[PDB]
Amino acid sequence: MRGSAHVVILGAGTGGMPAAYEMKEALGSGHEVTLISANDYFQFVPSNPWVGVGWKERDDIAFPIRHYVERKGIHFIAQSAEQIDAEAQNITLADGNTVHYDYLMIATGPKLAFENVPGSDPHEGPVQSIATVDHAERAFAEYQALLREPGPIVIGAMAGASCFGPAYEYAMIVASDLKKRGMRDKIPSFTFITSEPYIGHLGIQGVGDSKGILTKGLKEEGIEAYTNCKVTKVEDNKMYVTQVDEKGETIKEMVLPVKFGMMIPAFKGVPAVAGVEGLCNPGGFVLVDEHQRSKKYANIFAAGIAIAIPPVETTPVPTGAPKTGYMIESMVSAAVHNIKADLEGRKGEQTMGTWNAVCFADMGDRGAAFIALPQLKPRKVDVFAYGRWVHLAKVAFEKYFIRKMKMGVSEPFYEKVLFKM
Numbered sequence: 092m093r094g095s096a097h098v099v100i101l102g103a104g105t106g107g108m109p110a111a112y113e114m115k116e117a118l119g120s121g122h123e124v125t126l127i128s129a130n131d132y133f134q135f136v137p138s139n140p141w142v143g144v145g146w147k148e149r150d151d152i153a154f155p156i157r158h159y160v161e162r163k164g165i166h167f168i169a170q171s172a173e174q175i176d177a178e179a180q181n182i183t184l185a186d187g188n189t190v191h192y193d194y195l196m197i198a199t200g201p202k203l204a205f206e207n208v209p210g211s212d213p214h215e216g217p218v219q220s221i222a223t224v225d226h227a228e229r230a231f232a233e234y235q236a237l238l239r240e241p242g243p244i245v246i247g248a249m250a251g252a253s254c255f256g257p258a259y260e261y262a263m264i265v266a267s268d269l270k271k272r273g274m275r276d277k278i279p280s281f282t283f284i285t286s287e288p289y290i291g292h293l294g295i296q297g298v299g300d301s302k303g304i305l306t307k308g309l310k311e312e313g314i315e316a317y318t319n320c321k322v323t324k325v326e327d328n329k330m331y332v333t334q335v336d337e338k339g340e341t342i343k344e345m346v347l348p349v350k351f352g353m354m355i356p357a358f359k360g361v362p363a364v365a366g367v368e369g370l371c372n373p374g375g376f377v378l379v380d381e382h383q384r385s386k387k388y389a390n391i392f393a394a395g396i397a398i399a400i401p402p403v404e405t406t407p408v409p410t411g412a413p414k415t416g417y418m419i420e421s422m423v424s425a426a427v428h429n430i431k432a433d434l435e436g437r438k439g440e441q442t443m444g445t446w447n448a449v450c451f452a453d454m455g456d457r458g459a460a461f462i463a464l465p466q467l468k469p470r471k472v473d474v475f476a477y478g479r480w481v482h483l484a485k486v487a488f489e490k491y492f493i494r495k496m497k498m499g500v501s502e503p504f505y506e507k508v509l510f511k512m
């Protein structure tokens with residue numbers, strides 16, 4: 092309402108959870124902040140691959156949201172938005188109810204676009220998913236069924252995928268956990284299929300020696316690897332793979348039996364957001380400016396996977412650049428600062444900053460991690476590291492993040508630069 096704006100954050104994930112906290116902190120008691128989200132619980136996404144192999148439980152990485160935000164003055168609706176009317180500024184919930192907003196912050200993350208590949212939905216076939224704790228729990232279940240009836244494994248990333256790290260990570264920890272169970276030997280074949288033009292491309296044209304290190308690792312574990320692949324369909328427990336050359340022309344087609352597989356799907360914008368006329372690109376990604384404001388509606392902001400970022404390269408098989416934790420946080424904090432400025436008179440000049448990708452992967456005792464920035468080469472930072480410290484770092488950041496998501500954040504987040512000062 093007037094002189095008392097109502098700000099809605101849509102999606103309680105890696106961007107939205109902090110965004111609601113930071114928004115309430117910024118706007119104070121004279122403004123209503125509402126967080127709306129499909130599930131009643133927060134989950135630490137980067138931990139899912141480990142749930143997928145049974146190295147972590149749901150309760151280690153997920154918690155009920157309601158108590159933690161409400162004690163901070165935030166309203167929480169554990170309900171999915173089905174429809175967003177940007178003219179009337181009304182959101183229609185699953186249950187029929189309607190919620191009005193003066194400002195809307197979209198943090199809905201990705202739709203997992205299994206529809207791109209018939210058969211590929213985790214509920215339709217043997218190709219599973221580790222993107223959500225629901226899916227990962229399910230992936231682990233099928234993994235036990237593989238352990239009872241050893242059969243070919245296929246792990247990888249589909250065409251259009253943008254988040255490759257986890258595919259590599261999942262392939263290695265499965266290998267690792269097979270070995271530990273002392274049952275690696277029973278596996279007919281272990282294949283890695285990716286839409287990357289080469290191993291370790293990672294949708295960022297490689298970082299450091301990600302190519303040689305990831306290549307040598309898959310080899311070490313006895314995993315055969317194919318690049319430039321699209322999967323045309325999953326069917327009859329078989330994966331139909333088409334492999335192209337640098338020009339798109341086909342150079343072979345395979346038919347891979349799968350007893351247990353996991354392919355990272357392409358990400359699209361969720362439907363309620365994609366369905367807002369004029370809001371999104373053809374993928375369902377919110378077209379926003381440098382201040383995270385939608386280009387069509389001044390009172391709509393967007394942060395996280397939800398936003399549209401232009402491609403810098405066109406790969407033989409379509410691939411996308413990832414949107415990762417640190418940059419998502421800058422998107423969040425900028426959007427908060429820019430709405431507050433609006434509520435207070437000015438255009439917020441705050442931006443996301445320099446594009447960057449930061450990713451950490453834990454293999455058990457040691458980890459791999461990379462930092463790339465900016466998006467185009469030659470970069471200012473281009474580092475791929477492996478070691479125990481990466482593992483210590485992963486473990487530490489999860490603990491930190493889950494804790495912060497419970498106690499709240501003001502709060503220029505990554506003050507993870509006090510370990511210097």
Ligand SMILES: Cc1cc2nc3c(=O)[nH]c(=O)nc-3n(C[C@H](O)[C@H](O)[C@H](O)COP(=O)(O)OP(=O)(O)OC[C@H]3O[C@@H](n4cnc5c(N)ncnc54)[C@H](O)[C@@H]3O)c2cc1C
Pocket residue numbers: 101102103104105106107127128129130136137138139140170171172173198199200201221222223254257361363394395396397414415416417419449450451452
């Ligand atoms: C398996 C995997 C591992 C990852 N590993 C890392 C990594 O190690 N490091 C890193 O920096 N990044 C990592 N990422 C990338 C990225 O940081 C995560 O995907 C992160 O969760 C993105 O946050 P987000 O806010 O954009 O979307 P999300 O975290 O997915 O949150 C979106 C939220 O919106 C909700 N939602 C969607 N539609 C609606 C609707 N209609 N109504 C209400 N709610 C809705 C969803 O339920 C969800 O709660 C990883 C990604 C994946 C999938």
Ligand SMILES: CCCCCCCCCCCCO[C@@H]1O[C@H](CO)[C@@H](O[C@H]2O[C@H](CO)[C@@H](O)[C@H](O)[C@H]2O)[C@H](O)[C@H]1O
Pocket residue numbers: 256257259260263304305307308309450451452459460461476477478
């Ligand atoms: C974060 C997303 C990126 C992808 C996710 C993870 C994918 C899996 C990584 C596979 C790495 C396995 O291969 C591993 O690599 C490095 C090579 O530099 C080797 O490690 C080598 O360099 C490291 C330091 O960086 C030394 O500590 C080590 O003594 C040395 O042998 C390991 O002996 C080898 O076992």
